[PDB]
Amino acid sequence: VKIDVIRVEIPEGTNVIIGQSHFIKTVEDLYETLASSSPHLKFGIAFCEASGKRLIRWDGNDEELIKLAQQTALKIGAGHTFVIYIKNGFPINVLNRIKNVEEVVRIFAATANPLQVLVAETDQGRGVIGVVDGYTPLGIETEADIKERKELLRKFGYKR
Amino acid sequence: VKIDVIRVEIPEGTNVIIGQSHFIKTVEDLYETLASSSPHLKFGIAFCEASGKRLIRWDGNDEELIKLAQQTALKIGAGHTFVIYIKNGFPINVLNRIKNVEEVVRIFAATANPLQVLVAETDQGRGVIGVVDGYTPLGIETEADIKERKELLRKFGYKR
Amino acid sequence: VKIDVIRVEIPEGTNVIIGQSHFIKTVEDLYETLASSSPHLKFGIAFCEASGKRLIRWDGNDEELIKLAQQTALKIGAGHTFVIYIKNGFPINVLNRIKNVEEVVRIFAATANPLQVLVAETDQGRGVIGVVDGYTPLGIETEADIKERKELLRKFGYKR
C-alpha cells in the first residue's frame, strides 16, 4: 500500500484538531459543542462524508477557519476524517467536548506545531495511519527545566 | 514491516465498531454496557486475548452477530483488538458507553460503509495501524447541500 | 516512509500506558490525576515536548518507573508522545482518568504483554502509527472456556 505524507497548514494564532468520526450528524454536533463552549471561541469545521455524494461537510462561525478546515480535509482525503481549526481559544478548552461527541471515534491530533498526517491509500480509498506532531526529543529536562515549566503554568494562570 | 489490507464484512442492517482494549474483563464489560444501553439492541462481541491461550473471547445476544465479530477479529488477527457488531440500533447509541469502558484503549472505526482495516505485521505479531472508512471526498458542500442535510436530521428526528 | 519496530521494556509487576498529548501542562495533569487516583499507586511519567528545547518532560513518585518512562519515550522518539509506567495498581484503575485529561489526544496502548510501538519516519521527525500488543489469536473460545473466564473474574473479585 502507498503511504503519503500530508503537510497541514497551521496559520499563526490557530490550532488544529484532526480526528475520525461517522454519520453526517458529526457536523452539527461539533458546531454545537464548540459554540456552547465559549462565546468568543472562533472555529471552522470540516467532515469527510464517506459515502453517497462524498462531500466535505462544514460549518463554524469563522469563514477563514472553515476554509482552512476544508482545505486540510481535502489534502488528507480520507473518508470520515474531520478537521477543526480554532482561534481565540486553545485545544484544552474543547478537547474533552470533542472526545464526547457521540459520532466521534477518535482524535488524531490537537496542535499548533508543524504537522504532517500519514495517509495510506488502497484500491478503495484513503485512511489515516498517524501523524508527525512537532519534532523528536533531544534530551531529558533538568531540575532547572522543571522549575521553569512550573513557573510557566503559574504565569499563564493555569496552576497556582 | 509488511502491511495487510483486511476487508471487513458488514451485512445490510448492521454496523461494526472496532477498537483496542486490554484485560480479559473487556468482554463482560462490553457485554454489560451494551445490554443496559437498550432492551432491544442486538449485538455480538469478539476480543483478541493476546497472551496465554490467545483465544478469541466472545459474547452477545445474537448468534449471527457473534459469528461476524469472531470472523472479523480473526481476519484482523491483532492482539487486544475488539470487534462489535450491532443491529436494531446505531453506533451513536453506544459509542460513548464503549469509550468509557475502563479496559478500552481506543476505537479504530464505527461505520456501516465499506471498510478496510490496515494491519502491520512484525516478527512478534500483528497491529492495527488504521482503517479505510468509505471513500475519498469528491468536493465541498454548498449552501443548498447544507439546507438538505439539516432537513435530513430533522426528518429522522435527531434534531428539531 | 520507513517504519521502525520499537520494543518496549516492561518490568515484572508493572504496566505501561503510551499515548499522544499536547502542551507542557500534560505532565502536571497526568501526575495529578494519578496521584489522586490512589494513595498507594506508584508511577513514572514522560512526555515528549515537540518544540522549543524538545525535552523529555517528566514527573512521578517512583524514580525507577520515571527512568523507564524517560528511556521508553526516547526510544519511541515521536513528538508529543507520553509514556506512563505504573506499579502496585492496574491500568483499569486509571485508564479513564488518563482519557479524560484535557491535553490527552489518544492512547496507543495499556498493557503488560510484550509490546512493540510502530514508528513512521519522515523528514520532519517521528510518528506512532500503531502497536503490536501481544500475539495473534490461536482460535475461538468454547462454552467451557467462557465458564472459566467468568469464574476467573469472580476469583479476582472484579465481578460477582
3-state secondary structure of A104: coil
What's the gap in Å between the CA of A48 and the closest CA on chain B? 6
What 8-state DSSP symbol labels residue A8? E
Q: C-alpha cell of A160?
A: 497556582
Instruction: Give me the amino acid identity at C71.
Output: Q
Q: CB distance C24–A99 less than 8 Å?
A: no
Residues of C with CB under 8 A from a CB of A: 1, 20, 22-25, 27-28, 48-51, 53-59, 70, 73-74, 77-80, 99-100, 102-106, 120, 122, 124-130
Residue from A11, A13, A18 nearest A132 by CA: A18
DSSP count for chain C of H helices, then E strands = 4, 9
Minimal Cβ distance to C54: which of A116, A138, A152: A138
Give the C-alpha separation, B150 to B145, whole Å: 9
- Chain B hits for A125, CB-CB cut-off 8 Å, are 132, 134-136
Resolution of the experimental structure, in angstroms: 2.1
Give the C-alpha separation, B19 to B26, whole Å: 11
3-state secondary structure of B147: helix
Residues of A with CB under 8 A from a CB of B: 1, 20, 22-25, 27-28, 48-51, 53-59, 70, 73-74, 77-80, 99-100, 102-106, 120, 122-130
Given a contact cutoff of 8 angstroms between Cβ atoms, the answer to whether B95 and A102 are in contact is: yes
Residue C142, judged by CB atoms within 10 A of its CB (0-12, 13-18, 19+), counts as exposed
Give the C-alpha separation, A19 to A107, whole Å: 4
**H/E stretch holding B94:** helix B91-99
What are the distances in angstroms from CA B83 to CA B28, B72, C119?
13, 7, 25
What's the gap in Å between the CA of C50 and the closest CA on chain A? 5
Question: DSSP characters for A40-76?
Answer: S-EEEEEEE--STT-EEEEEES-HHHHHHHHHHHHHH
3-state secondary structure of A3: strand
Which chain C residue's Cα is nearest to B49? C137
Residue A49, judged by CB atoms within 10 A of its CB (0-12, 13-18, 19+), counts as buried
Q: CB distance B23–C91 less than 8 Å?
A: yes
3-state secondary structure of B36: coil
What 8-state DSSP symbol labels residue B9? P
Give the C-alpha separation, B3 to A148, whole Å: 44
Given a contact cutoff of 8 angstroms between Cβ atoms, the answer to whether C4 and C27 are in contact is: no
Give the C-alpha separation, A151 to A82, whole Å: 35
For this PDB entry, the determination method is: X-ray
What are the distances in angstroms from CA A139 to CA A111, A143, C24, C117?
21, 13, 15, 20
What are the distances in angstroms from CA C40 to CA A59, C35, C43, C67, C90?
47, 9, 10, 19, 12
Residue from A149, A148, A119, A147 nearest A131 by CA: A119
Given a contact cutoff of 8 angstroms between Cβ atoms, the answer to whether A59 and A82 are in contact is: no
Which chain B residue's Cα is nearest to C134? B50
Residue from A107, A103, A98 nearest A133 by CA: A107
Given a contact cutoff of 8 angstroms between Cβ atoms, the answer to whether B20 and B82 are in contact is: yes
> Mind listing the domains of chain C with CATH numbers?
1-160 (3.40.1520.10)
Backbone φ and ψ for A142, nearest 5 degrees, come out as -100, 180
Strand partners, C20: C81, C106
| Residue in the block written with cell 472508512 | B133
What's the gap in Å between the CA of B102 and the closest CA on chain C? 5
- Chain B hits for A50, CB-CB cut-off 8 Å, are 111, 113, 133-135
The separation between CA A144 and the C-alpha centre of its own chain, rounded to angstroms, equals: 32
Contacts of C156 (CB under 8 A, 6+ apart): none
Which chain B residue's Cα is nearest to A98? B96
Instruction: Give me the amino acid identity at A142.
Output: T
What are the distances in angstroms from CA A16 to CA A89, A100, B94, B100, C12?
11, 18, 27, 25, 39
Q: CB distance B92–A104 less than 8 Å?
A: no
Minimal Cβ distance to C56: which of A139, A150, A153: A139
**H/E stretch holding B70:** helix B63-76
| Residue in the block written with cell 525535552 | C55
Residue from A74, A31, A27, A24 nearest A49 by CA: A24
Question: DSSP characters for C53-95?
Answer: T-EEEEEES-HHHHHHHHHHHHHH--TTEEEEEEESS-HHHHH
What's the gap in Å between the CA of C60 and the closest CA on chain B? 22
Give the C-alpha separation, B140 to A48, whole Å: 9
Residue from C102, C153, B145 nearest A91 by CA: C102
CA dihedral A104, A108, A114, A118 (to 10 degrees): -120
Give the C-alpha separation, C86 to C134, whole Å: 19
Give the C-alpha separation, B30 to B46, whole Å: 10
Give the C-alpha separation, B159 to C136, whole Å: 43
**H/E stretch holding B155:** helix B143-155
3-state secondary structure of C38: coil
For chain C, list the contacting chains (3+ Cβ pairs, <8 Å). Answer: A, B
Give the C-alpha separation, C133 to C112, whole Å: 9
For chain B, list the contacting chains (3+ Cβ pairs, <8 Å). Answer: A, C
Q: CB distance C118–B106 less than 8 Å?
A: no
Give the C-alpha separation, B24 to B30, whole Å: 11
Given a contact cutoff of 8 angstroms between Cβ atoms, the answer to whether A35 and A46 are in contact is: no
CA dihedral C14, C19, C25, C29 (to 10 degrees): -50
Q: C-alpha cell of B118?
A: 490496515
Given a contact cutoff of 8 angstroms between Cβ atoms, the answer to whether A18 and A81 are in contact is: yes
- Paired sense of beta strands A81-87 and A2-8, if any: unpaired
Given a contact cutoff of 8 angstroms between Cβ atoms, the answer to whether C78 and A132 are in contact is: yes
What's the gap in Å between the CA of A145 and the closest CA on chain C? 9
Which chain C residue's Cα is nearest to A16? C22
Backbone φ and ψ for C93, nearest 5 degrees, come out as -70, -35
What sign results for the dihedral spanned by CA atoms B104, B107, B111, B116?
negative
Q: C-alpha cell of B86?
A: 450491532
Contacts of A67 (CB under 8 A, 6+ apart): A44
Contacts of B154 (CB under 8 A, 6+ apart): B160
Contacts of A18 (CB under 8 A, 6+ apart): A8, A72, A76, A81, A82, A83, A84, A107, A108, A109, A117, A128, A131
The separation between CA C76 and the C-alpha centre of its own chain, rounded to angstroms, equals: 12
Q: C-alpha cell of C151?
A: 469464574
